[PDB]
Design a protein around this ligand. Structure first.
Ligand SMILES: Cn1c(=O)n(CCCO)c(=O)c2c1nc(Oc1ccc3c(c1)C(C)(C)N(O)C3(C)C)n2Cc1ccc(Cl)cc1
Ligand SMILES: Cn1c(=O)n(CCCO)c(=O)c2c1nc(Oc1ccc3c(c1)C(C)(C)N(O)C3(C)C)n2Cc1ccc(Cl)cc1
Ligand SMILES: Cn1c(=O)n(CCCO)c(=O)c2c1nc(Oc1ccc3c(c1)C(C)(C)N(O)C3(C)C)n2Cc1ccc(Cl)cc1
Ligand SMILES: CC(C)CCC[C@@H](C)[C@H]1CC[C@H]2[C@@H]3CC=C4C[C@@H](OC(=O)CCC(=O)O)CC[C@]4(C)[C@H]3CC[C@]12C
Ligand SMILES: CC(C)CCC[C@@H](C)[C@H]1CC[C@H]2[C@@H]3CC=C4C[C@@H](OC(=O)CCC(=O)O)CC[C@]4(C)[C@H]3CC[C@]12C
Ligand SMILES: [Ca+2]
Ligand SMILES: [Ca+2]
Lengths: 656, 153, 656, 130, 37
């Protein structure tokens, strides 16, 4: 009926005399504490266990009593840690000059705790002494404590006030630290919420440090500095997307992209397209002018990064417009030839093909297997050239094994000429699909193209779910229908399969069954395929129920789930779309800055005393950037909820 | 009307994918083009009761891939009278890959970004409509043009 | 290259001595102002046309200098409004003791402004002096002033502090006021944003007033009070959804719903349905028992509202399975009978049809004509019963003009027997669709059923735009294809239209063209319908392009638009779904509380002195509810950003 | 700050006119944004503009254009244009009579003032209930 | 003349809404610093 309540976690109660002592300390009564500490007769005094009359003194940051305990031999213990957390400078140096339960883990060090608070003044005061942060990497002996110690160390290293005070190159260490913390959010898969916040903090510090640049001279000194646009390439390597997409960094990049050319045009977008097509038409003239005279008024005009990109685009566009004129302009009746020689276009499309393979290999020397697969557009490029090698090789094989001409209806099942035609057609799809990557250069279609590919990975996760439901139902339908497989002789027009006028043998084999359930997603499989000649009503009804259940799961449940996660993913992506696109466009621009492979694929087939000064200039600019950043962040650190406490403390002095 | 411009940007992505697959299908199927005489009741193309010559020419191939968005192209158009199996299977795989990209990926992408745009537009809908209605009203304040077109001449 | 800056609207500047006067009052100095005022009888012309120091005295609520100024005849003007806005009680009553630019509109009065602030103490102070509020009704002039004046009046009447002080029945006036402000949010369509906030505030006041009830006796007094569950019925008519859906109001209603019969709260989900079924099977014996022995042990069982609901549902359910049995029991003998008499089923379902008509008329006159219309489940009931009248009447007519039997294949085109069969089948769909309304009684399917109907209006608006696009494209296709219309004789199986095996004449007439474009939404129109026998390639291509353009607009643009707004609407609706469902379930429950129409339709066709005390009890409870509400509101009105200012005021006295 | 701005303007101050772009691109862009951030001040317009409503119309439209041409600094220019659009709307919210509203909307610089608002796409100004 | 009245009302309202708790506490503390009596 009732629930009696008692104290289970019993404690040693403080005496009434002891409570008065702490009450006097809490009110700053110097006189009472002095007499109460005057009984040096060795009783109730402070021992290694203590009670502590110093934490409350630190709590109120009243310096008068705080010094009164220290000379009376009170066990300080971890008192310095409590002072640092309070962020009171006066109490910290008082305890510094005087050099069982705790609210701090035993791995916490005074320099570590100061960096956690990000207090510039206290961190600086501590570093004027010997301080050393342990280097992060024993996990088996105690795993909980090892993980917490590692996170505490990284939380101190990632402090903007510590980096600005003790890093030779604050920008570089923020790049490395942000990358390291991003990796740890995966390997240390349990503590990912705290490491990601630390990584985002390091990325902000470098971005805010360059925001203090006041002139273009300062900005170019930072971005062109070599450790031993070098600094901008390091930012791309570490995936510093916010740093790269800064308006001043983007403005400097556009100056080198357009170069002398007045490409900064933004008016009457119609004439932009008309003007852009002008250079593309005369692209071969620019290529030959550079080939025969690198130094000329028109010779170096192709050297412009924006002009070079247009020339390469028009050269590629000619290739696609060249294969398109191969089934509509050349082949009239030379199709009964068993093995044909390369035609007029094939001979005159061959140099384009060789340039692509040579260009791919020539850039394969830089980098290697790594840093190349992770670019998915290079995966497409590998497929085109591999397929282009197969059709070229398969064409000359049929040129030596066949000489006569026979009607196509009499050729073999796997004739080499037929195989090459299939491989060539697949390459044409891949070649035209590469024009999508050119959309990054456009400010209207760029963000959309980047967004489209940014969530194709969520599609792959779903298609693995669907591929298992498809295989489950294909097993059942084939296990029920394989008894009634009929030969192509008995079918009308000698046609067997689902590509006939009358679809038949839809579930006869497992290979056919997998295709039948694929085409039912688009409604291209008729319902009469669930019928067999034996007219066994029970068997046919069961098969139609398997087919109907598969349709409900796929077209009502799975595809509606797919729509649901596009909506959720697109909302998150749309916020970061502008930064993501500008990072991608930057990599496109820098690929045309360097002096290498400037000629189009149709033409490319033809085969220290100063360093000491530059480091001094970089350090001088870095010193000014840090000074402006520290002054700014100090101003924003002040808040009304903090000034009220200080204003109250000064107003306490009414004794006068 | 406020977000028909976003549709236009998407329709340029689709037109590039449409052109890529129409090139491959026409490059594979143009050898087997047949005359209208050899087809039943002298009908050639996909507008016939028995669809034929779906990928014979580039102009026909572009229409065939358009009508497959609405499911109006039958699957037997991937078959040819020669019956080389390998050629017909490759063509049906090009057709199937185009269907996945368009009807499962691109159209669902359009739905996702159409939902996001409508959220931002709906907040400003009242202000946008009242601005448009004001221009309608002020067009009838002027004295000129009072008479309707049947009498204004 | 420079923009000079000047003061364009410059007024008279305050001189040095006047400015010194102003800052003397600002700092609270008395002797300076007193001496300055005592010597300002000759050079300072303080009059009805002078400038003022009273407002700053009110601002710092320094009553001493404020009191001083009235002693020297300073033009007060509308300084009382400034004191009321500051919400300082001392300054208000001081200004009340003594009997061109302003920050207030000329229509604002002291009582109206006090109600805007919702300050209980100041409003009470002013009301004690016999104040009045103008009654709300463009004007002869200043339509702008009329709109602002009306909103200012309603902003004062809708003040909870004013209602609590000067309303005989605060709950009723909050009901009426909230309804009135909801109407004004449409008629005054320009100022809807402010009126909606006022209406929401009134609906909250009544809800928070009943939240102060502390016993079921108090709640029953409020809800059963008749001004001339009466008070709960008034809340339904004013659409007080939040008031009705309160957990204590819903709890009281539940005890009346289960009129002593077990509350059905500890039954299993599967067990729940099992013991619901047995009561339904016993409905025939319960109805007759009440008919012969109403005062019996089981005669009054049907009086319980929840039992009556189950009995009526089972009686209706028997009718639906009964129609379902009509098509599986009649022999094919009547197939050739021209005019058949009602069969075994038709004769034995006739009384149940009349019960629905009699019940419909009974509740039609009770609600009038406007209450009946505003219920979309009654439109279905009217249409369903009208079709049953036509079906019965048309069978009688066919019974007198036909006696023999003829095969149906040679029957007339519009035979009356055929027409009746079509009308009977349509009403069968409507009868079964009526079972959806029963979902409101369920806690799982209830909120979902209410959600589906809550935005069918948005579908209707969208379907009007689509119908105009459909009409536009049906005009062009018919204008292009009507030349090639062919007779049914020339078609293969004497079949004309799109309902044949080989579709033809899809766009021959406008009526056919409208159906063809409807069925193309679901993909049921084949592409060869764009082909005509003349084989004119130009016109056939044009027709297919207009057909293709319609498909893009409908199936890619319009239907995706529908999904977008249907998703946005669902997010807003889902927040209020629980309140909306509970309001709907309440109306369902109260319909079974009344004695009228206790018997199901199969059986329903068979043929003051005390009012003074009740008002006293209601007023006593209202007094306690208001007192608790005012105390809670006053306590909750305290804030950190308000308490600090008064702490500074007392601290600034410092006279010791 | 209305009081400090008025104090300084009385001492015959000036502001450079916004448009040299190649000597220092970073400094030129920041200088231009600083000038427009001062011109778009509601307290400066209220003190030193002959027609505050027309000034906010032109300035708000000019800042909208700059949010495209200066495509890199669009975030700061967008909130400056929105600030000018709000000022004109809030200034007309102080009308207390239909005579005052009719004087404003029918004024010809030489419903003329309402036609100018449609030209500059002042949608919030046009859609005001009054 | 109308513009002058509109600006005057706008400025008076703008000054009132510029007052805040986070700022009023500052000069409230500063006034109390005049504790010399
Ligand atoms: C998967 N499936 C299917 O394959 N077919 C084709 C069979 C061969 O053509 C169908 O017709 C078919 C079908 N699901 C269908 O809806 C149903 C049917 C039953 C249920 C449900 C849905 C849910 C899951 C809601 N539930 O509560 C039960 C009672 C189990 N129906 C229509 C149908 C057909 C006959 C009858 Cl007696 C009743 C309904
Ligand atoms: C594009 N495409 C197609 O065109 N057809 C028709 C061919 C001619 O009719 C199909 O049948 C077809 C098809 N994609 C299909 O699903 C697949 C198949 C394989 C994969 C995947 C999906 C994913 C991308 C998830 N992945 O991991 C792999 C392994 C590459 N299937 C069904 C099918 C058919 C035969 C087999 Cl052995 C296995 C599956
Ligand atoms: C409405 N419409 C249609 O009705 N048909 C059937 C005609 C009869 O069957 C189609 O084939 C068809 C079609 N829209 C189609 O895509 C297009 C085509 C052109 C454009 C666009 C989309 C957009 C609007 C993006 N734009 O920029 C232009 C250049 C105007 N195509 C496919 C097609 C067919 C032939 C060619 Cl040469 C090129 C493309
Ligand atoms: C034969 C078929 C397969 C060709 C396909 C036609 C189009 C889809 C292609 C052909 C030319 C391409 C264009 C070539 C050059 C440009 C200019 C380029 O301009 C920029 O915005 C970048 C330069 C700058 O503004 O700084 C943007 C991409 C664009 C429009 C390309 C986008 C894709 C286009 C229109
Ligand atoms: C029989 C077939 C053709 C289905 C078509 C009819 C159903 C849609 C109807 C018939 C009986 C109805 C039920 C009759 C009684 C109740 C009890 C009612 O529950 C309560 O009043 C207490 C339990 C709770 O709080 O949910 C909830 C609605 C429910 C299940 C009804 C929901 C709708 C039902 C299932
Ligand atoms: Ca490559
Ligand atoms: Ca009814």
């Amino acid at each position: 009926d009732r629930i009696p309540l008692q104290i289970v976690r019993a404690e040693t109660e403080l005496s009434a005399e002891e409570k008065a002592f702490l009450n006097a300390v809490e009110k700053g009564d110097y006189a009472t504490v002095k007499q109460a500490l005057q009984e040096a007769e060795i009783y109730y005094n402070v021992n290694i266990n203590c009670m502590s009359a110093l934490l409350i003194a630190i709590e109120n940051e009243n310096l008068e009593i705080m010094e009164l305990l220290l000379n009376h031999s009170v066990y300080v213990g971890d008192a310095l840690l409590y002072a640092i957390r309070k962020e009171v400078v006066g109490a910290v140096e008082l305890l510094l000059s005087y050099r069982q339960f705790s609210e701090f883990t035993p791995d916490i060090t005074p320099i570590m705790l100061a960096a956690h608070t990000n207090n510039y003044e206290i961190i600086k005061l501590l570093v004027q002494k010997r301080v050393t942060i342990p280097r992060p990497h024993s996990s088996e002996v105690d795993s909980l404590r090892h993980s917490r110690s590692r996170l505490n160390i990284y939380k101190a290293l990632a402090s903007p006030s510590l980096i600005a005070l003790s890093s030779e190159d604050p920008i570089l260490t923020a790049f490395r630290l942000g990358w390291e913390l991003k990796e740890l959010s995966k390997v240390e898969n349990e503590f990912k919420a705290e490491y990601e916040e630390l990584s985002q903090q390091c990325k902000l510090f470098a971005k805010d440090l360059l925001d203090q640049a006041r002139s273009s001279r300062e900005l170019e000194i930072i971005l062109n500095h070599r450790d031993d646009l070098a600094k901008l390439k390091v930012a791309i390597k570490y995936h510093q997307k916010e740093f790269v997409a800064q308006p001043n960094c983007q403005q400097l990049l556009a100056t080198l992209w357009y170069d002398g050319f007045p490409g900064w045009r933004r008016k009457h977008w119609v004439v932009k397209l008309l003007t852009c097509m002008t250079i593309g038409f005369l692209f071969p003239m620019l290529s030959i002018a550079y080939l025969i005279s690198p130094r000329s008024n028109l010779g170096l005009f192709i050297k412009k990064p924006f002009i070079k990109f247009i020339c390469h685009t028009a050269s590629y566009l000619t290739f696609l417009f060249m294969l398109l004129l191969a089934s509509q302009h050349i082949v009239r009746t030379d199709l009964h030839v068993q093995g044909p020689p390369p035609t007029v276009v094939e001979w005159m499309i061959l140099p384009w093909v060789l340039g692509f393979i040579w260009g791919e290999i020539k850039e394969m020397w830089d980098g290697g297997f790594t840093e190349y697969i992770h670019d998915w557009w290079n995966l497409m490029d590998f497929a085109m050239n591999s397929l282009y090698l197969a059709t070229i090789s398969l064409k000359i094989m049929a040129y030596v094994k066949y000489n006569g001409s026979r009607p196509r209806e009499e050729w073999e099942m796997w004739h080499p000429t037929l195989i090459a035609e299939a491989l060539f057609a697949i390459s044409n799809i891949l070649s035209s699909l590469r024009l999508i990557s050119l959309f990054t250069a456009n400010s209207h279609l760029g963000p959309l193209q980047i967004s489209l590919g940014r969530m194709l990975l969520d599609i792959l996760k779903f298609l693995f779910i669907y591929c298992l439901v498809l295989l489950a139902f294909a097993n059942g339908l084939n296990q029920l229908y394989f008894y009634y497989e009929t030969r192509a002789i008995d079918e009308p027009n000698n046609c067997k399969g689902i590509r006939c006028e009358k679809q038949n043998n839809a579930f006869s084999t497992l290979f056919e069954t997998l295709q039948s359930l694929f085409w039912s997603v688009f409604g291209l499989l008729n319902l009469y395929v669930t019928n067999v000649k034996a007219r066994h009503e029970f068997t046919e009804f069961v098969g139609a129920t398997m087919f109907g259940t598969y349709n409900v799961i796929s077209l009502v449940v799975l595809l509606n789930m797919l729509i649901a996660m596009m909506n959720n993913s697109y909302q998150l992506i749309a916020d970061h779309a502008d930064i993501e696109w500008k990072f991608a466009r930057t990599k496109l621009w820098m690929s045309y800055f360097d002096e290498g492979g400037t000629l189009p694929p149709p033409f490319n087939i033809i085969p220290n005393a100063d360093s000491l000064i530059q480091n001094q200039h970089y350090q001088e600019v870095i010193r000014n950037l840090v000074k402006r950043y520290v002054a700014a962040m100090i101003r924003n650190s002040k808040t009304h909820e903090g000034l009220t406490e200080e204003n109250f403390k000064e107003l306490k002095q009414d004794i006068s």
